[PDB]
Structure formats: structure tokens, C-alpha cells
Design a protein around this ligand. Structure first.
Ligand code: N32
Ligand code: N32
Lengths: 412, 412
């Protein structure tokens, strides 16, 4: 009894732009959105750069009063969520509002808000904690606020699976629709971790590039001189719709979401298995889910974080799943341009996977100057590659050995 | 091909006990776990009491070296998870590990760790932030660390739906099993929010009881003089198992999980609608999901937080859904005794709803001295009521207007 799920709406904030067609222009032109951070003093930090959303005006979306109650990550997820709903042309009615849900997640949630309230608490005591500190900081408040704003009475939840969050949110929402629990879902992720604790936390884990002299060159997935990931901010939301609901209202359809894989590695808290066994199981489950032979995959949007162990583990995973086909598909990391939006990474990379299908073009991996040992696949170095893409795959893995794979197909 | 799902294992840390049987004895005896908070100086705070886990020894489960790097919510989540898996008698093998997953959630996760690291950041500087801060504090690391310790390679994720988290984590895991994505899932939630930001934050929102003179009488759901909820910490975990998988290995089955409802209110960020329309919609979805006549419901474990608005919304929902049968069923709030474990509230209350079925007894609502206007149902005031229970329901509501209902049935 499994219903087909298609994408009818997309919304985005990224370091490359304030919407989807600005971010995508940047992806195809191979631009970086990485720069020295301007909103705080990082003198004592070992990393001083990352991907900020530049020029965000929350009052295009909310009243000043509404915005003052919400952490930036929630502001960001609402912006991308409202763009996606507008993009879909969906009309919410008394007849359909219990068939429309939301699954917007985040990896690290209201860390920035918690920092600012912590400063007030330490400087002047608990009477200075904002009344809205709790509702304004918790990860489900993108789902909560969106559903209250639009009157959505379908499944209302949030995933938090670290750097896998966006991929899991989109996949579980697909499941909701395929198994008849909803007809429409808004899904994706938002992240704003560019605070003392985020740069300091990930930096204490020795997980960040320290290439402070050349921020636009720091993120270089599968390059021999990679030294960790680049911390970035933003959001991605997709409108997922049962196929016949989309066709019934004359919705423009971007792609079909055919396959979803999850699988734990059970390996280590913060490092992947070098052999890519985790990504491997997950991609295979996603392909089984889609009813697709590995040889039908044309494009992979890699997780490709620019860490030493992560990048090579992903090459191994792909070689295992795809055998000889590995040298026929294209794989790239848009994190080379966007940096790592953590729990939003899978959301914005789903969108880029969908636009690779719409536009028949593999986005580049910029800064891929000297591919490392074993990195001999078509990694689309430096420049966008026009090619045939009928099937795009998007991979995410996260802390705690969490893995997510989405399979999208062109459809005409 | 929707498969049936049973409970084969349960685990818990609560203000009444360091396991299920100790906690349940507390519940049936009408014992309060609420006491003045010992682990900090709260003289500047308007709320100075709550439910602590008392005498918790993480070394009954994990080495000192590991435990030291984990926030209390992760220690609580792992303890409950390990209890539930031992209680199930399940053996993890190469033949099944890919069919066993985990969904242990939290409302806000690593708040104590975040506060302590903020202190380090503001007094000392970023070089004093723990390298284990991110993996030891983020919400998906109960799922992550449990997969790593036991070798679980099934679906690995975490929900964060505020005070609804433990109910949704259980329900969605059951959906995973129902649709073939897993045969076994460890599901529930864990919370430790008893720090400056938690008491200060919920206090600033004016959500907390301020009955400092009488802590054990502060939590009084449906009582006229209720003045906000009581903040508690802990964890609940269930082993969910496909029925033929349970039968095949001859497992002890506690109950069947026959229904799961979700719904957004789409009303307000921190307040329910007075009529409880979201709770009503959620319970109706759950009962329809279970294929039951509403007159089959014998026992409701209410969300019942002791907030002025929440308690009366939930009587209105129960009147709307069950009509005259609202006067035949028993409804109680175990939060009268445990207080509010937030993201874990739905986990520990699921376990109490299953034990109500095993032991044919409705837990009491303690402190119900003066039922408020319209609170004219059997709310099991003061003392446990032995009675027939074939079907038990557990309700959860959260900030963001998130709702979830679980329906359990004696297995035969
Ligand atoms: C235990 C070790 C060894 C160490 C050495 C090599 C490395 O590459 C890093 C820096 C990062 C590993 C990794 O890719 N994790 C890792 C992962 O498993 C899953 C997701 C991500 C992500 O960024 O989304 C990620 O980053 C690790 C982390 C920590 C200290 C240095
Ligand atoms: C907007 C208002 C009005 C106000 C007036 C009387 C009240 O009863 C409270 C205190 C609590 C509302 C409520 O139960 N929320 C509420 C909710 O929707 C969902 C879950 C819970 C829970 O604890 O699990 C919860 O607590 C509200 C909260 C805030 C300030 C005072």
C-alpha cells in the first residue's frame, strides 16, 4: 500500500545566498561562502572563519516581537520552511490541515541562545533569564511555530541526529507520506552553531580546519592537505507531497524521493570505520528501498566534510556498493563551497541533489587540487559538469555512527 | 503487511527508584519523589525543589572514565536502555544486529554540560572547553552510545518534541517495526534539566510550582490550588519487538502497542487550547489506529502536569473523545508523585501504563484534595485503584502544540 512521494517546494538559507536560486547560482559558479567571522571576538579560538548567512532579515518572515522570542536556528528554519511552502503553492484548508505535518530538525539546536542566557545568568543572576529561553531555544520549535503559523495539524515532530539530521528528517517525513499518515510534510533542518561553544566545542574535538590564512580554501574534501571541516549556518526545507495529491492540484514536481536508508555503524562516537561499512550498509538499504540496482545511480552528493578519516571512508563505501560503476557515476561535496551546516547539511544537500536532477549538472568539489591516495573517482574537481542524471543519491553520517541516504529520481 | 508490536523489556531511573520495580512500588504506594534540591544553591531562585534521581551509581553500568565525559541525561538514558535490554533477554548477534535499532530522545539534552562549559568559556576561555563537550552533550548520543556499546546497526535516531519526546520516540520506533524497517527497537527518553538554566528558564516562563514550603504537595494535577509543574529528571526505555520475533524466541511479553496518534494543535507555543482540541484529535487518531471502540479504554495515564491551563484542557479532551464513557474509565497523573521528567515523561508513563495492564491497577493521583470545576471524572485521588484494565492510553503534550498518544492492550 506504498504511496509515491515527490518534491513540490524547496527553501534555503546558506552562506551562498538567502534563497534556493541564489545558493544554486553560487554552487554552479563554484563560489565559496566561507569568510572570517564578524559577529564576535575569536582571538583565543584556533578557528576564526566559517559560513555565516549574510544579510538575513527575519522581518521578511516574522514581526520583530516574534523574532526576539526565537534563536537564530529557529529563525533560519522558519525562513526556509516559509520559502518551501510558498514555492509549493500549497493551500492549507479545513479539509486538508490534519494531513499536513512538519519535521524540521537541528543537530545542536539553541546553543547560541543558551550561551547568551548563560552570560546573563552568570553576570546578574537568574532573574535575567529571558521568559522565552525554553520555547525559544528547543529544536522542535521550528516544527511547532510553523504548524501554529500555517494551521498544520498533521504529524508534528523534530529529529536530532547530529550531522545526519536533515537527511533523517526528509526520509522519515517521506515514510509518513508513503504509509498514508500524511499527504504533505515540510521537512529539513536548520543550524546556527557559530558561537563560542560551537567553534570552541568542535575545535576542542580537533574536528575543524585551522587554515585561518585562507578561509575560502579550508574546505577541500578528498584533497591531500585537508585538516577538518568548516562550521557553517543556515537551513533547508522541502515540501514532500503524495504524487496524486501533487498532480490533482497541478503542482510543479522537482523529483521523486524513491529511497531512504538509515543504519547505525555501531563503531565509534566521533570517527567512521575507515572501510566505510556504515555508509555502505546505508546506501544499499536506500537502494533496496528504491527497488534500484546500484548501476542506475548517476550522481552522489557526498557527506564529504573535509576531515582526514571521513572523506576516505566515503570513497571506500562507494567503491564497495558500486564496484566498477563507481568510475561511471559522479560524486562531489558542495561542502567545498558551503562548509558544513551540520544538522542542516543533509537538508541543503537534498535540495542540491534535486537541482542536479532538474538541471542535469554535477556540482563541483572546489579546492580539490591534489586528490589523496585512493581518491581516483570522478569527484568533479573545480568546475560544474553537465551530464545525464536520472538518479541522485545524498549521503550523511554523524556522531554516534548515525547514517542517512536519500535516493531521488527524475520523473517525466 | 503492517506487523504487530509488543513490549518485551523495560528500564527506568526516576525520582521514586533506580529501576522499574522500585519506581512502580513507589507509584502504587502514592510516594512523592519531590524534595528540596541538594546539588546547588538556589536561594536566588523562586523554585528550589524537584525530583532528583537519588543514589544513582553510573558505575553499575559504565566505567568512571567513560561516565565522566557524558552529561547526566546520557548516563540516565544508557542506564534505562541497559536495564530494558537485560530485562528483554534479547541476544544481539550477526544474524540480527542490523534489525535492532534505537530511538532514545530528550527535550533539551545536555543542559548541565552546556552550563558548566559556558562557565569555563566565560571565566577561563575557549581552551578550557572539554574535547568531549559535543559528543557528551548532544541529544542523539543516547542512541549513538547504546548502538556502540551493544553493536546495534538498525535505524539509529533521536526525537526532540519537548514534553512529548518519550511518547513520540516509542510510537515512531513501533512504526519502524510495523513497516519492516526493524524487528527490535530500544525507545524512550531521558532528561536532566535540574541546573541554573533549567530552573531559571522554566521559572522565568512562569511554568513551575513555587510551593517551596511543601515540595511533596506542589504537584497536584486537577486540584484547585495547582500553581505549575514540578521539574524532575530521569529516563524510561522499552524494548519494542515484532510479535512473531517475540513468540519465536519465547520472550516474556508485557503488552501489545496497538495504537499511536500524533497531531499539532496549531494553537500556541507554550499554552494548550482550553477545549483540548489537539489532545482530542490525537487520542481519536490513536484509537482509530488501534481499531478500538473508545469504550474499550479502561485507564488513561494523563499528561496531567499540574499547570492551571493544561490539567483542564485534558479533562475537556477526554470528555470530547469518550462522552459518557469518560465517567467509566479511570484517569490518573503519576506526575502527582514523580513530577515532570519532560522528554522522559512519556517514556516512564508508557512503562506505568504497561504495568497498570500487567497488575490490573490504576495508579493514584496524589494531592487531589479539592478537584477543580469540571474535574468530575474518576481521577483515582490519593490511592491506587485495583480494577479491570484491558486497554491503557498514555497522553503527552508539548511546547509547539505537539501531541502524542500511545494505546496498550493486554496480550492474548
Ligand atoms: C577520534 C578522533 C580522531 C580524529 C582524527 C581524524 C579525523 O578525521 C577526525 C578529526 C574526524 C573524524 C570524522 O570524520 N568524524 C565524523 C563522523 O564520524 C561523522 C560525521 C562527521 C561530520 O563532520 O559530519 C564527522 O566529522 C577525528 C576525530 C577525533 C579527533 C581526531
Ligand atoms: C502562555 C502562557 C500562559 C500561562 C498561564 C497558565 C498556565 O497554566 C501556563 C503556566 C502553562 C500552560 C501549559 O500547560 N503549557 C504546556 C503545554 O502547552 C504543553 C506541555 C506542557 C508541559 O509542561 O508538558 C505545558 O506546561 C501558561 C504558560 C504561559 C505563561 C503562563
Amino acid at each position: 500500500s506504498r504511496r509515491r512521494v515527490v518534491i513540490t517546494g524547496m527553501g534555503m538559507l546558506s552562506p551562498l545566498g538567502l534563497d534556493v536560486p541564489s545558493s544554486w547560482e553560487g554552487i554552479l559558479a563554484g563560489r565559496s561562502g566561507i569568510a572570517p567571522i564578524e559577529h564576535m571576538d575569536l582571538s583565543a579560538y584556533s578557528t576564526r572563519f566559517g559560513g555565516s548567512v549574510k544579510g538575513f532579515n527575519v522581518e521578511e518572515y516574522l514581526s520583530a516581537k516574534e523574532a526576539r522570542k526565537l534563536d537564530l536556528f529557529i529563525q533560519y528554519g522558519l525562513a526556509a520552511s516559509f520559502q518551501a511552502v510558498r514555492d509549493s503553492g500549497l493551500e492549507v484548508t479545513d479539509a486538508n490541515r490534519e494531513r499536513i505535518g512538519v519535521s524540521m530538525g537541528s543537530g545542536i539546536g539553541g546553543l547560541t541562545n543558551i550561551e547568551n542566557n548563560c552570560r546573563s545568568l552568570f553576570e546578574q543572576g537568574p532573574r535575567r533569564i529571558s521568559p522565552f529561553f525554553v520555547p525559544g531555544s528547543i529544536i522542535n520549535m521550528v516544527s511547532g511555530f510553523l504548524s501554529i503559523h500555517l494551521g498544520l495539524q498533521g504529524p508534528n515532530y523534530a529529529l536530532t541526529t547530529a550531522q545526519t539530521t536533515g537527511t533523517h528528517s526528509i526520509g522519515m517525513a517521506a515514510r509518513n507520506i508513503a504509509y498514508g499518515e500524511a499527504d504533505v510534510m515540510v521537512a529539513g533542518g536548520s543550524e546556527m552553531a557559530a558561537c563560542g561553544l560551537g567553534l570552541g566545542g568542535f575545535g576542542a574535538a580537533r574536528a575543524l580546519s585551522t587554515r585561518n590564512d585562507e578561509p575560502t580554501r579550508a574546505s577541500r574534501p578528498w584533497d591531500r592537505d585537508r585538516d577538518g571541516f568548516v562550521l557553517s549556518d543556515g537551513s533547508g526545507a522541502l515540501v514532500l507531497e503524495e504524487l496524486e495529491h501533487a498532480r490533482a492540484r497541478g503542482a510543479r514536481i522537482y523529483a521523486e524521493l524513491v529511497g531512504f536508508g538509515m543504519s547505525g555503524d555501531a563503531f565509534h562516537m566521533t570517527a567512521p570505520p575507515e572501510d566505510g561499512a556504515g555508509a555502505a550498509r546505508c546506501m544499499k538499504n536506500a537502494l533496496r528501498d528504491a527497488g534500484l540496482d546500484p548501476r542506475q545511480v548517476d550522481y552522489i552528493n557526498a557527506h564529504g566534510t573535509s576531515t582526514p578519516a571521513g572523506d576516505i571512508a566515503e570513497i571506500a563505501a562507494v567503491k564497495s556498493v558500486f564496484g566498477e560503476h563507481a568510475h561511471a557515476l559522479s560524486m562531489s561535496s558542495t561542502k567545498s563551497m558551503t562548509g558544513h551546516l551540520l544538522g542542516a547539511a543533509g537538508a541543503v544537500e537534498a535540495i542540491f541533489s534535486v537541482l542536479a536532477l532538474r538541471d542535469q549538472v554535477a556540482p563541483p568539489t572546489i579546492n580539490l587540487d591534489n586528490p589523496d591516495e585512493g581518491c581516483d573517482l570522478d569527484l568533479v574537481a573545480h568546475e560544474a559538469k553537465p551530464r545525464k542524471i536520472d538518479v541522485a543519491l545524498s549521503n550523511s553520517f554523524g556522531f554516534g555512527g548515525t547514517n542517512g541516504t536519500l535516493v531521488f529520481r527524475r520523473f517525466a
